[PDB]
Design an enzyme around this catalytic site. Structure first.
Site, PDB file in Angstrom:
ATOM      1  N   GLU A 423      26.643 -35.829  -6.511  1.00 38.48           N
ATOM      2  CA  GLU A 423      25.803 -36.592  -5.544  1.00 38.48           C
ATOM      3  C   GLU A 423      25.873 -35.880  -4.187  1.00 38.48           C
ATOM      4  O   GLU A 423      26.120 -36.550  -3.166  1.00 38.48           O
ATOM      5  CB  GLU A 423      26.152 -38.088  -5.515  1.00 38.48           C
ATOM      6  CG  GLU A 423      27.608 -38.434  -5.244  1.00 38.48           C
ATOM      7  CD  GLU A 423      27.849 -39.929  -5.032  1.00 38.48           C
ATOM      8  OE1 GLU A 423      29.006 -40.415  -5.261  1.00 38.48           O
ATOM      9  OE2 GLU A 423      26.860 -40.622  -4.631  1.00 38.48           O
ATOM     10  N   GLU A 432      22.472 -30.795   2.341  1.00 36.39           N
ATOM     11  CA  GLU A 432      23.952 -30.701   2.253  1.00 36.39           C
ATOM     12  C   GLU A 432      24.346 -29.458   1.451  1.00 36.39           C
ATOM     13  O   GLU A 432      25.564 -29.189   1.361  1.00 36.39           O
ATOM     14  CB  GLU A 432      24.537 -31.996   1.698  1.00 36.39           C
ATOM     15  CG  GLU A 432      24.314 -33.172   2.630  1.00 36.39           C
ATOM     16  CD  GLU A 432      24.958 -34.464   2.179  1.00 36.39           C
ATOM     17  OE1 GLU A 432      25.568 -34.464   1.091  1.00 36.39           O
ATOM     18  OE2 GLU A 432      24.842 -35.463   2.915  1.00 36.39           O
TER      19      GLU A 432
HETATM   20  C1  MTA Z   1      30.460 -37.951  -2.284  1.00 38.77           C
HETATM   21  S1  MTA Z   1      29.769 -37.012  -0.961  1.00 38.77           S
HETATM   22  C2  MTA Z   1      29.882 -35.359  -1.609  1.00 38.77           C
HETATM   23  C3  MTA Z   1      31.320 -34.916  -1.926  1.00 38.77           C
HETATM   24  O1  MTA Z   1      31.311 -33.583  -2.455  1.00 38.77           O
HETATM   25  C4  MTA Z   1      32.388 -32.848  -1.873  1.00 38.77           C
HETATM   26  N1  MTA Z   1      31.964 -31.442  -1.874  1.00 38.77           N
HETATM   27  C5  MTA Z   1      30.936 -30.921  -1.191  1.00 38.77           C
HETATM   28  N2  MTA Z   1      30.802 -29.606  -1.452  1.00 38.77           N
HETATM   29  C6  MTA Z   1      31.755 -29.278  -2.305  1.00 38.77           C
HETATM   30  C7  MTA Z   1      32.157 -28.050  -2.965  1.00 38.77           C
HETATM   31  N3  MTA Z   1      31.478 -26.906  -2.755  1.00 38.77           N
HETATM   32  N4  MTA Z   1      33.204 -28.112  -3.791  1.00 38.77           N
HETATM   33  C8  MTA Z   1      33.865 -29.263  -4.033  1.00 38.77           C
HETATM   34  N5  MTA Z   1      33.550 -30.426  -3.450  1.00 38.77           N
HETATM   35  C9  MTA Z   1      32.509 -30.486  -2.600  1.00 38.77           C
HETATM   36  C10 MTA Z   1      32.551 -33.433  -0.490  1.00 38.77           C
HETATM   37  O2  MTA Z   1      33.845 -33.145   0.095  1.00 38.77           O
HETATM   38  C11 MTA Z   1      32.258 -34.914  -0.725  1.00 38.77           C
HETATM   39  O3  MTA Z   1      33.426 -35.707  -1.007  1.00 38.77           O
HETATM   40  C1  JYX Z   2      27.278 -40.048  -1.530  1.00 41.14           C
HETATM   41  C2  JYX Z   2      25.956 -39.341  -1.514  1.00 41.14           C
HETATM   42  N1  JYX Z   2      25.594 -38.887  -0.168  1.00 41.14           N
HETATM   43  C3  JYX Z   2      25.643 -37.612   0.350  1.00 41.14           C
HETATM   44  N2  JYX Z   2      26.047 -36.553  -0.355  1.00 41.14           N
HETATM   45  N3  JYX Z   2      25.223 -37.548   1.597  1.00 41.14           N
HETATM   46  C4  JYX Z   2      24.892 -38.860   1.921  1.00 41.14           C
HETATM   47  C5  JYX Z   2      24.408 -39.422   3.098  1.00 41.14           C
HETATM   48  C6  JYX Z   2      24.187 -40.797   3.071  1.00 41.14           C
HETATM   49  C7  JYX Z   2      24.452 -41.533   1.919  1.00 41.14           C
HETATM   50  N4  JYX Z   2      24.925 -41.001   0.785  1.00 41.14           N
HETATM   51  C8  JYX Z   2      25.119 -39.693   0.841  1.00 41.14           C
END
Ligand code: MTA
Ligand code: JYX
Lengths: 625, 310
Positions: A423, A432
């Site tokens: 997600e 993101e």
């Molecule tokens: C639930 S929001 C997305 C989550 O993915 C994690 N995340 C984002 N990018 C990476 C990555 N490249 N490797 C592992 N975890 C990640 C973030 O730290 C966050 O908790």
């Molecule tokens: C948990 C999913 N998520 C990510 N990755 N960015 C967000 C911003 C707002 C709400 N959920 C989000």
């Protein structure tokens, strides 16, 4: 319910008047600060030396009353734009005098008319008052929906009212406001008091005001009908406008005398209360999203940053989102293990960005629903969150869940995955860097493996909002580009705005990405046909993702996932607002750009005129890799 | 001060109107200080005004008086700040003044009233932009016209025609009305749009000519017939607030301005007399019915001045 006030142009005793209108249920009173008929001379003797006092004493109310209950009114003889030089000079002096008095009294607002086209000298004089000491008080510019000249009874034999269709002409009052505010350089202290008449104009004419800073709506007693039991009420269409205005949370002002005699002025007011209490009460989202309206926030960057524990709390507080994820995994399992294999076949399921584990739990709920067997990895780079995961895996999950504390791009997997679940999506889908993260992880997905999600697509729509343009503009900061504010996206519950065109897809990403040479850069051109006159202030962004087959998430308004409160819309501003005329096409250009270090968006409007390219080189805004 | 008469009279003298018998009607507002109200006074000795304890009758009005008119010999019709037109009746002995009707029909300051030659109807004008026609006997609005697009400055009933009156407005329109026409209003005045019109007076004899004054101090003589601007002189250095014709055979025109001066003009709009007597805004003028050489002016300087016009 409703905040409303009384407009009067007669106050014999300010004590009694205020008590009376309070007795009647008004929150505040709009009134003259000088006697409306008390024309003053500033230059010519003898009138100039008129013995004072020039008005009634500030001692007649408490500071607190002046601060909260009173809105001032410019005297109606004051005409700064008069073509008569001497009237212009006295009107300048008197306007200053009256504004300075409101400020002396600490009035919270002060009403000024836009009752004709040329308000240049009025604008100039107001801008001067504003640039004399920094104060908070508001200027409410009293503008009619419909110019009085276009409202007049057709009763002049030799001067008939033209009934020829008049698209731009019927919008002239918006242009009066627009020009005044542009002269005053979008001061946050200058807002609209929209005066409404018996004749509502065309809906296009009302639509002109969608994105504008309306603080008050003035309702004359005139425009109220009478029902059978003699109560004042409003036409179904007057009611619709009121409902629109209640959503914008303006203050209502009742002006003119009582025309429903064997009823008090609270009869008008009780009607309004009646309409507000009898509005469709707010859905779950509308209550969740309530405090957040037109509030600008930085987009999360959970790759480059470790999110806080309460950030994950609110992610976890969106059950509709996880129901969808459960269901996508549910369906994907059944598709992948036949009933004859359920017990011999155990699917390696890897959560990529597992936060504090709700995706892990959903995967668990999915497998027992599907009655199929799953091995989980829970991959998370935020080591703070890994703490939550490892306490969960010890106390609850047991060894079905291997927690991996690493970057998915770096991690060496003990084995390949049947399914990866992520997600990693912002309000503009790929903002993101879900593409880069999942690209880095894909080498450990089995050649027949499923990514959930398989796909996401960003959408853009041009918007008008002078409110949001002004909010962005006010985000200037020391020790950076004075215009950097305008070259970065904001997440925001878009509220006071106008969508100028249906959203169109911008950028799309697919997982796994088969491409021989994968390239996540993009260049999109979008043409937005616009069927109104308007001012472009920026582009609302939204997204859609396919979790699996028919199971999706969307914040795209036309397909919004119902009752899902996660992800407000995103907003790309532009430095200079662009006038757009009904029939014209807005052409916008968006790039997704990158190094090894950072990904960013650049953007340019190329029609009906060109903007500057926004955020060239990622100079104002980048997303860390 | 008689029974029902205030001890003190509001400073800003707004209206001065001799009755047939030479008795003087005064309207006054409080345009400053704590209380923004007004008053009506009868002075059967006109040389005793403005002094409150030498008065025949006086009374307090809820709000200020923007305009005034006699109705015959005992009626006072009042244009209020309150948005009310109010009818005050005289007393039998004529020792007090008593409210007969007070109607809140306008949505803003009532700026202007005139009684129609009838004597049983009047027309008010207002900052609410409307012009109303009133049955005085029935205490109601017969007609209500949104002819104009800005506040109404002046309304003047024709001398001899109870369906005819002039209006003018900051929308820069002078309107000739006749209520007998299905579209009652007819836009009249000079070739070119000029400066906003501020004051109107029908010629008392020739009921197809009138004079208007503008916001730039010019007085102008107009013919409804030739519907074109006959004569005009620059009489004042500020807006012309009032125009009053003498009772004379060939009548003199009294011209008052915010320049604080009085001018008296002949038929050709030439200057005969001029009075600086006032040291604030000159608000009204009435010619004595008893002495047609006597002209009485009031101002915001609270002076009642009696002029001898040569
Ligand atoms: C639930 S929001 C997305 C989550 O993915 C994690 N995340 C984002 N990018 C990476 C990555 N490249 N490797 C592992 N975890 C990640 C973030 O730290 C966050 O908790
Ligand atoms: C948990 C999913 N998520 C990510 N990755 N960015 C967000 C911003 C707002 C709400 N959920 C989000």
């Amino acid at each position: 319910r409703v905040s409303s006030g009384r407009d009067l142009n007669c106050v014999p005793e300010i004590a009694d008047t205020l008590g009376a209108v309070a007795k009647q249920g008004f929150d505040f009173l709009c009134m003259p600060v000088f006697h409306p008929r008390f024309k003053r001379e500033f230059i010519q003797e003898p009138a100039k030396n008129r013995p004072g006092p020039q008005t009634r004493s500030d001692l007649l109310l408490s500071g607190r009353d002046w601060n909260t209950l009173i809105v001032g009114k410019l005297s109606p003889w004051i005409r700064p734009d008069s073509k008569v030089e001497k009237i212009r000079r006295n009107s300048e002096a008197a306007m200053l005098q009256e504004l300075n008095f409101g400020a002396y009294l600490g009035l919270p607002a002060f009403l000024l008319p836009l009752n004709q086209e040329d308000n240049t000298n009025l604008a100039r004089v107001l801008t001067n008052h504003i640039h004399t000491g920094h104060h908070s008080s508001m200027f409410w510019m009293r503008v009619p929906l419909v110019a009085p000249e276009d409202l007049r009874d057709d009763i002049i034999e030799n001067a008939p009212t033209t009934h020829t269709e008049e698209y731009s002409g019927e919008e002239k009052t918006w242009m009066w406001w627009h020009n005044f505010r542009t002269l005053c350089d979008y001061s946050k202290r200058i807002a609209v008091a929209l005066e409404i008449g018996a004749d509502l104009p065309s809906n296009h004419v009302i639509d002109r005001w969608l994105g504008e800073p309306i603080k008050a709506a003035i309702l004359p007693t005139s425009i109220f009908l009478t029902n059978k039991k003699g109560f004042p009420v409003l036409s179904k269409m007057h009611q619709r406008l009121i409902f629109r205005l209640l959503k914008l949370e303006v203050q209502f002002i009742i002006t003119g005398t009582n025309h429903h005699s064997e009823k008090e002025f609270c009869s008008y007011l009780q009607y309004l209360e009646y309409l507000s209490q009898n509005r469709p009460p707010p859905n779950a989202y509308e209550l969740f999203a309530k405090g957040y309206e037109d509030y600008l926030q930085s987009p999360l960057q959970p790759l480059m940053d470790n999110l806080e524990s309460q950030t994950y709390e609110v992610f976890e507080k969106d059950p509709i989102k996880y129901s969808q994820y459960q269901q996508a995994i549910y369906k994907c399992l059944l598709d992948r293990v036949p009933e004859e294999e359920k017990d011999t076949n155990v699917q390696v399921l890897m959560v990529l960005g597992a936060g504090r584990g709700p995706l892990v739990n959903a995967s668990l709920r999915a497998a027992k629903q599907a009655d199929r067997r799953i091995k989980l990895y829970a991959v998370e780079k935020n080591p703070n969150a890994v703490v939550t995961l490892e306490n969960w895996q010890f106390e609850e999950w047991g060894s079905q869940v291997t927690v991996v504390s690493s970057d998915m791009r770096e991690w060496v997997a003990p084995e390949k995955a049947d399914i990866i679940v992520s997600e990693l999506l912002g309000s503009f889908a790929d903002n993101e860097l879900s593409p880069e993260c999942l690209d880095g992880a894909q080498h450990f997905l089995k050649d027949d493996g499923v990514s959930i999600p398989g796909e996401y697509t960003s959408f853009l729509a041009p918007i008008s909002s002078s409110k949001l343009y002004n909010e962005v503009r006010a985000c200037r900061e020391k020790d950076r580009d004075p215009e950097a504010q305008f070259e970065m996206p904001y997440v925001v519950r878009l509220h006071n705005f106008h969508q100028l065109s249906a959203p169109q897809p911008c950028f799309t990403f697919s997982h796994p990405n088969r491409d021989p040479m994968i390239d996540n850069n993009r260049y999109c051109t979008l043409e937005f046909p616009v069927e109104v006159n308007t001012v472009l202030h920026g582009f609302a962004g939204y997204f859609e993702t396919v979790l699996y087959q028919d199971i999706t998430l969307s914040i795209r308004p036309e397909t919004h996932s119902p009752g899902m409160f996660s992800w407000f819309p995103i907003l790309f501003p532009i430095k200079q607002p662009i006038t757009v005329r009904e029939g014209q096409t807005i052409c916008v250009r968006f790039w997704r750009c990158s190094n090894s270090k950072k990904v960013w968006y650049e953007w340019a409007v190329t029609a009906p005129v060109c903007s500057a390219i926004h955020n060239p080189t990622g100079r104002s805004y980048t997303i860390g890799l | 001060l008689p029974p029902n008469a205030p001890a003190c009279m509001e400073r800003q003298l707004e209206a001065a109107r001799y009755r047939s018998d030479g008795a003087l009607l005064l309207g006054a507002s409080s345009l400053s200080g704590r209380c923004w109200a007004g008053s009506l006074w009868l002075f059967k000795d006109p040389c005793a005004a403005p002094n409150e304890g030498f008065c025949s009758a006086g009374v307090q009005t809820e709000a200020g008086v923007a305009d005034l008119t006699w109705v015959g010999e005992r009626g006072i019709l009042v244009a209020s700040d309150s948005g009310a037109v109010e009818l005050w009746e005289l007393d039998e002995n004529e020792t007090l003044i008593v409210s007969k009707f007070c109607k809140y029909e306008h949505d803003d300051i009532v700026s202007t009233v005139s009684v129609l030659s009838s004597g049983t109807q009047a027309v008010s004008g207002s900052k609410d932009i409307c012009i109303k026609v009133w049955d005085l006997a029935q205490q109601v609005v017969l007609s209500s016209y949104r002819a104009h697009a800005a506040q109404v400055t002046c309304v003047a009933a024709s001398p001899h025609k109870d369906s005819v009156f002039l209006s003018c407005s900051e929308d820069n329109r002078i309107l000739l009305w006749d209520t007998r026409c299905p579209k009652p209003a007819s836009q009249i005045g000079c070739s070119a749009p000029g400066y906003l019109p501020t004051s109107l007076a029908w010629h008392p004899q020739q009921s197809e000519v009138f004079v208007f004054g503008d916001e730039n101090g010019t007085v102008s003589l107009v013919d409804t017939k030739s519907t074109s601007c006959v004569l005009s002189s620059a009489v004042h250095s500020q807006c012309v607030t009032g125009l009053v014709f003498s009772p004379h055979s060939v009548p003199f025109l009294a011209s008052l301005s915010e320049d604080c001066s009085l001018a008296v003009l002949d038929s050709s709009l030439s200057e005969l007399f001029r009075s600086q007597a006032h040291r604030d805004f000159v608000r009204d003028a009435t010619w004595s019915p008893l002495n047609h050489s006597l002209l009485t002016t009031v101002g915001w300087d609270h002076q009642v001045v009696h002029h001898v016009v040569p």
